[PDB]
Design a protein around this nucleic acid. Structure first.
Lengths: 63, 386, 136
RNA sequence: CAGUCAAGCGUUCAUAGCGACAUUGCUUUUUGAUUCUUCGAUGUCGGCUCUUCCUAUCAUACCGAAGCAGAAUUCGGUAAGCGUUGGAUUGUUCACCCACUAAUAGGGAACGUGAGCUGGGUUUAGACCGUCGUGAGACAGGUUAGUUUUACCCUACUGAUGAAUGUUACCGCAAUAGUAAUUGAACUUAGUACGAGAGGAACAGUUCAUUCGGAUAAUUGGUUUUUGCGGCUGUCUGAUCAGGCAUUGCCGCGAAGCUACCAUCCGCUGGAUUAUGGCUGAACGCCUCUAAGUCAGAAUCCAUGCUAGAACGCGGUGAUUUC
RNA sequence: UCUUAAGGUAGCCAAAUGCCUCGUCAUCUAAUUAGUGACGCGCAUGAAUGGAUUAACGAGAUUCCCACUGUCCCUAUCUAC
RNA sequence: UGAACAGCCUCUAGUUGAUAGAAUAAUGUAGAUAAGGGAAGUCGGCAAAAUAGAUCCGUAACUUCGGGAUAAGGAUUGGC
């Protein structure tokens, strides 16, 4: 087996836990949770969301 | 006049009456078929339903598409501390059925089981089985002959056992007590086996083994007085309807001028005895051991109890069971396990099972981490972590 | 499927009932597909037959070419938009639901496919695999 | 609806299958006929819902016959166990079409069912047309609009308690009643058998699904008064901080719990039998499945199993009050 | 040719008038006893017993399409009383 | 606040009345939300939803030339 990375939060997705999405352009996204999923459908930016790994690494926290 | 468009009986009538059980501990109606060629051993067990979780393994049915591929499966977990054998009774057979002629207990008893004899224990002399111990306190004064009576008679024997509700994390202190049939060897052997095992633990490593199909017998969760619509699966009547739509519209014809039993009706849902079968065991595991949650592939030392515990149960520090799928019964509840009655091979009951990974994540939410080590690793330190 | 069931199928959560209009993905001239029936469908009272991924169906064209319009035709689903569950527990869903015209045996009357499809359909209907760009 | 008979059809041949002319019966699901009950009122079509029953069996199980090579089909038997759809138009019953289907069989229960719905239709009063009528007015002729009441009683039903058995607690038995699992596809057998060719099987085996059921809530989804976190508008609290009101103010997230063929898991094997085919076997010195005896045999029947446990069915066991 | 006081003219239709009738043709539909457009030996259309249209208006009757939706597949959950 | 003696909050004045207490089963009444599909339901889209203010843009047939027309249909809207 393997573990993966939420498009939004960038989190380990242990098997089965979480949702998957396949846009018409064949981009396969994965979501650990409906929180991330709903934000994605809202077309939010994780780099702006604070608790996200992208914001974390863009503001240079936990270096 | 006839039914214009056909459709089947809503619900199942073998499972009637849909009424509250006689107990919080489902009766075991039937045990397997006794045979003598095997050794004396139990044919049932008792534990407490703890909860569910989810695992991973490699299927093997030669002809599927997930043959030799991974899957993920919902399992159910039971906490099965070893049951204390105390006593046995003897059943002689009549044209009026099996019938107990003797119940032999043991000398010494635990507060939990004689509490189960009592109701108001906190104000009690605790006077129970004292004169039984005084029938004991000698060599065999009035016990040896009961045993030999059971030998001379009693085609069937059932061993009395009780649980360790104090080993559980529960808050009851009132042990559960029950009988199990033995389906091995001869009758003298059964009784002397039990005599050896008076006041003695018995465990799941002895009663069961992996890849065994069993029956789960328990009482299904109570849902109160309920309408016909959830209780039977009847069509919700339409929007425009005076005086209720969560109903059955016609409940019978003019003639017979009575309500037929088969018609649906509101009333008790749940707290029902149920006996589900063909539940493959996937893992026995040990309280007196760590790494219960760790397969040969993971090898990350971790028990089965997730972060923050089982919801409404706690920990699994006793011997435990992981079985495929669901079972009748809710969390914190008793459960009566049972060997099968029939040598189902089917290339489904013989599918040998070896595991890969076991979700030990928090069910009190949407848990991302199986371990706080992993948690701190992913997160870094924290304000509280000085 | 039946006829063109190159093997079997595992159940898929059902989200395309009769009355559903779903996109057409192929190069056959169509724009939409009005589902009206399902093969291998169950027969229960006041239950709508529901299609799935891989389920061959009978459909109509409410929008498209006047050679295709006003006649039924077999069609096959490749996209669902309803979260179903594979044996690895992955809950997955597209954003749209679409299909492709076919013959009863399963060969696409159209020569191509425009977008992603489902691996189940790709494994069950080989001509779709032939005309597939991307699979999942 | 089913029989008797059999001129004829069926290449030849009455009976594989049909079966005119003639004839004997059955049913009450039509429609008449009658007017026994009912006019100090039995709520009146259909649909929806929901159960149950019959079989004159559409499909499924096992079988027999064929103008049955195979496939497909037709006839017939035990069989009502199990199932018999979604839609278009119509108030519709009915009909007709579309499509799936294993198959889309017919009927009964006060033409089941209105203190269960609805009120399209019919069936008051308003109104329009046509025809009839001098006219008021008439028309199972057409159209439109038109109040659908009460259960708190008894019974039945579902669930739920419960006196009395010397008391109380625990473990059990199991009378009786109920009962459930259903059908299809795909691969393989095998492009084999069979068939001149055309075409084209089957049993076993495997994986899957349909329908129904019984549980469960790890996962996903839903729900959210956790009024838990954050935010938003208006206004009030001098401003801030923090908060009230806005019939739960609104939004996003949202655990727990409940819940979903929208999710998951499970859904037993033995005996006696029918029809049918048979074994030995006479009557009838042969022969014959039958007469005595006897074998296998089905979705049947009964048990296994499962559900409740007789509250007036029972058993085993423990402890049984003192100043 | 019989007969009438004279024999329905313009125009309109299976229309709220048309039994037969689910009239025939077309269209809308996968399918339409509906809807619309045409046809007219119209049982029984029709001219201030007003005919044929008619913009706008209608808590009028009717059909279809877009959107929308717990009407529905198929139900579930929550709140106050 | 806002186009507004709308709706919502407040000041003065007035009330705090309407049997109450405990729990929160069914069925209801009133209010709501619901994945995928989208009227397949039904006599019939009944009920409910969706749209909604303002500014800008654009605007069909038909017409009694007056209208239809907010046609349709699209964009934008905060704070400092």
């Amino acid at each position: 087996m393997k573990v993966e990375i939420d498009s939004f939060s960038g989190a380990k997705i242990y098997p089965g836990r979480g949702t998957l999405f396949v846009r018409g352009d064949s981009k396969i996204f994965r979501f650990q949770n409906s929180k991330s999923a709903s934000l994605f459908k809202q077309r939010k930016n994780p780099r702006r969301i604070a608790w996200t790994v992208l914001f974390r690494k863009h503001h240079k926290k936990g270096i | 006049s006839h039914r214009k468009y056909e459709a089947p009986r809503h619900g199942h009538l073998g499972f009637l009456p849909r009424k509250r059980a006689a107990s919080i501990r489902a009766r075991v109606k039937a045990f397997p078929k006794d045979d003598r060629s095997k050794p004396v051993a139990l044919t049932s067990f008792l534990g407490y339903k703890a909860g569910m979780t989810t695992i991973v393994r490699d299927l093997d049915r030669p002809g599927s598409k997930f043959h030799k591929r991974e899957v993920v499966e919902a399992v159910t977990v039971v906490d099965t501390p070893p049951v204390v054998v105390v006593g046995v009774v003897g059943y002689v057979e009549t044209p009026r059925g099996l019938r107990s002629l003797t119940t032999v207990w043991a000398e010494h008893l635990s507060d939990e089981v004689k509490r189960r004899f009592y109701k108001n224990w906190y104000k009690s002399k605790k006077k129970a089985f004292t004169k039984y111990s005084a029938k004991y306190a000698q060599d065999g004064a009035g016990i040896e002959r009961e045993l030999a009576r059971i030998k001379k008679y009693a085609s069937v024997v059932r061993v009395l056992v009780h649980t360790q509700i104090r080993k559980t994390p529960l808050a009851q202190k009132k042990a559960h007590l029950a009988e199990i049939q033995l389906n091995g060897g001869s009758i003298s052997e059964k009784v002397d086996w039990a005599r050896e095992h008076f006041e003695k633990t018995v465990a799941v490593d002895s009663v069961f083994e992996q890849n065994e199909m069993i029956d789960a017998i328990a009482v299904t969760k109570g849902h109160g007085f309920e309408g016909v619509t959830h209780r039977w699966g009847t069509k919700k009547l339409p929007r425009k309807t005076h005086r209720g739509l969560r109903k059955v519209a016609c409940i019978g014809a003019w003639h017979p001028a009575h309500v037929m039993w088969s018609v649906a009706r509101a009333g008790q849902r749940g707290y029902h005895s149920r006996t589900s079968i063909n539940h493959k065991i996937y893992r026995v595991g040990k309280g007196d051991d760590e790494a219960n949650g760790a397969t040969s592939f993971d090898r990350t030392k971790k028990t089965i109890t997730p972060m923050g515990g089982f919801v409404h149960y706690g920990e699994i520090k006793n011997d435990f069971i992981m079985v495929k799928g669901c079972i009748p019964g809710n969390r914190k509840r008793i459960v009566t396990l049972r060997k099968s009655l029939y040598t189902n091979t089917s290339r489904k009951a013989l599918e040998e099972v070896s595991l890969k990974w076991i979700d030990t994540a928090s069910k009190f939410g949407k848990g991302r981490f199986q371990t706080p080590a992993e948690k701190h690793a992913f997160m870094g330190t924290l304000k509280k972590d000085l | 499927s039946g006829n063109g069931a190159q093997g079997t199928k595992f159940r898929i959560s059902l989200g395309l009932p009769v009355g559903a209009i779903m996109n057409c993905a192929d190069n056959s001239g169509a724009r939409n597909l009005y589902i009206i029936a399902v093969k291998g469908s169950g027969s229960r009272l006041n239950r709508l037959p529901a299609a799935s991924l891989g389920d061959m169906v009978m459909a109509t064209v409410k929008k498209g070419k006047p050679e295709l319009r006003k006649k039924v035709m077999p069609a096959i689903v490749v996209r669902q938009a309803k979260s179903w569950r594979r044996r690895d527990g992955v809950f997955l869903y597209f954003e749209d639901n679409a299909g492709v015209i076919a013959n009863p045996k399963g060969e696409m009357k159209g020569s191509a496919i425009t977008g992603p499809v489902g691996k189940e359909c790709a494994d069950l209907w080989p001509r779709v695999a032939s005309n597939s760009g991307v699979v999942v």
